[PDB]
Amino acid sequence: DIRSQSIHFLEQSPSERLQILQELGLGRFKFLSKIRLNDSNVDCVIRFFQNPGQMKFPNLSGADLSELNLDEVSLIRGNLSEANLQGSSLLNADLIFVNFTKADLRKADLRGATLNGTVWLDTLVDECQLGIGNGLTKQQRKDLQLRGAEFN
């Protein structure tokens, strides 16, 4: 039945979603109001809706976040394992400790995003814009640039 709740949520416009989010105390996650209705995201929103407030590291594993404006989103300690971020805008985003394992970041724009503690295992970054690699090592600015990332 909780699957039913999540479908209905994603069927609403961004501001009706933002209201549901207030009613549920999930208002810190304003980005939920933007993700598209598809199978990947029904699942993602189920995790938020089964026991809300019991997850407070944003777990977006496997979500389809492609071609979204997520400028200045805060996702500290978030799990973006296997997520799809192709062509999305994440300008000045807080991504500290974000797990990008096996995620797709082709053509995303992460200029100015804070990257301390990020994990990039098997991550697709061809043409991902990283700006200055804010918070990245050197062995990281190395590895990623080799794999297609672009640095300002």
Side-chain angles (χ1 to χ4, degrees):
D1 158 285
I2 277 293
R3 184 164 184 96
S4 313
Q5 188 172 338
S6 294
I7 297 178
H8 160 269
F9 171 79
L10 292 170
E11 268 162 348
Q12 300 315 312
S13 73
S15 70
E16 290 156 351
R17 287 187 190 179
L18 272 179
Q19 268 314 76
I20 297 176
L21 287 186
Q22 282 267 298
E23 192 150 6
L24 282 160
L26 292 169
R28 46 188 187 290
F29 307 128
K30 284 153 193 163
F31 60 79
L32 287 178
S33 68
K34 302 186 194 165
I35 65 176
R36 281 186 308 273
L37 177 48
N38 58 35
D39 301 317
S40 293
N41 289 348
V42 183
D43 290 337
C44 165
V45 171
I46 285 163
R47 289 190 306 252
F48 280 81
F49 276 4
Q50 78 191 4
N51 209 353
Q54 176 66 5
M55 64 148 294
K56 297 193 81 129
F57 301 150
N59 177 13
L60 300 167
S61 59
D64 186 332
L65 310 173
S66 52
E67 294 193 37
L68 289 170
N69 181 355
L70 302 172
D71 287 4
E72 311 203 79
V73 67
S74 196
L75 298 167
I76 309 182
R77 269 138 182 153
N79 188 9
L80 273 73
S81 291
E82 295 147 83
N84 184 5
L85 283 70
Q86 293 184 100
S88 316
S89 198
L90 287 98
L91 302 184
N92 312 324
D94 202 355
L95 312 180
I96 289 170
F97 274 142
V98 168
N99 193 351
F100 286 118
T101 292
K102 272 176 180 162
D104 194 338
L105 278 49
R106 296 171 170 208
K107 300 187 196 165
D109 190 1
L110 273 64
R111 285 182 299 177
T114 309
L115 298 176
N116 297 84
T118 51
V119 171
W120 301 85
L121 171 63
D122 293 319
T123 306
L124 302 187
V125 293
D126 188 51
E127 291 167 303
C128 185
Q129 303 198 58
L130 290 180
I132 72 192
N134 224 304
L136 294 168
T137 75
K138 175 44 61 182
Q139 198 81 8
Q140 279 179 327
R141 283 208 187 94
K142 277 176 60 164
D143 197 4
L144 297 176
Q145 157 110 301
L146 218 41
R147 299 151 70 184
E150 276 152 25
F151 284 103
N152 178 44

